[PDB]
Write a protein that binds this ligand. Structure first.
Ligand SMILES: [Cl-]
Ligand SMILES: [Cl-]
Ligand SMILES: [K+]
Length: 164
């Protein structure tokens, strides 16, 4: 297990434009295109993202290319954020992947707002952090996925992803 495998499980793989859990146009491995309700707008973003006139369908290779870019960007955002970096730096590799997961899902800004949870994580108060994490819109809207991530922070193991 690693961040790529983890996110591939949490995000799936779809080669045609579809709507994510929030109703937003996405493609590939959780690559958010736009929050716009306009499919055309989404197609335009896709084309720009891939570098070609696609008409809403991409190849597996293409999907993976955006995925790699997206994971990289997530990590990059964590390292640049004053709130996140310190936590990230304080974590072991498994846990670091769980934080990246959250950032891919909600963005730098969104995770940076989990102030209290972040603090518990930096204090290495696993159970408490887990409890706190669950008190969020994130957990309520995507409970199975959140549970997986939370378990990862709680245990520092990949048990939640084991066998998926
Ligand atoms: Cl992009
Ligand atoms: Cl879920
Ligand atoms: K998805």
């Amino acid at each position: 297990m690693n961040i790529f495998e983890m996110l591939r499980i949490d995000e799936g793989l779809r080669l045609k434009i579809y709507k994510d859990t929030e109703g937003y146009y996405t493609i590939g491995i959780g690559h958010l295109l736009t929050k716009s309700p306009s499919l055309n707008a989404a197609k335009s973003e896709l084309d720009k993202a891939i570098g070609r006139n696609t008409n809403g369908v991409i190849t597996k290779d293409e999907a993976e290319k955006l995925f790699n870019q997206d994971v990289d960007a997530a990590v990059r955002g964590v390292l640049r954020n004053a709130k996140l970096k310190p936590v990230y730096d304080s974590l072991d590799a498994v846990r670091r992947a769980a934080l990246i997961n959250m950032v891919f899902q909600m963005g730098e800004t969104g995770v940076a707002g989990f102030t209290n949870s972040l603090r518990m994580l930096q204090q290495k108060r696993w159970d408490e952090a887990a409890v706190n994490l669950a008190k969020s819109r994130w957990y309520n809207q995507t409970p199975n996925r959140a549970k997986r991530v939370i378990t990862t922070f709680r245990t520092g193991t990949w048990d939640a992803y084991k066998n998926l």
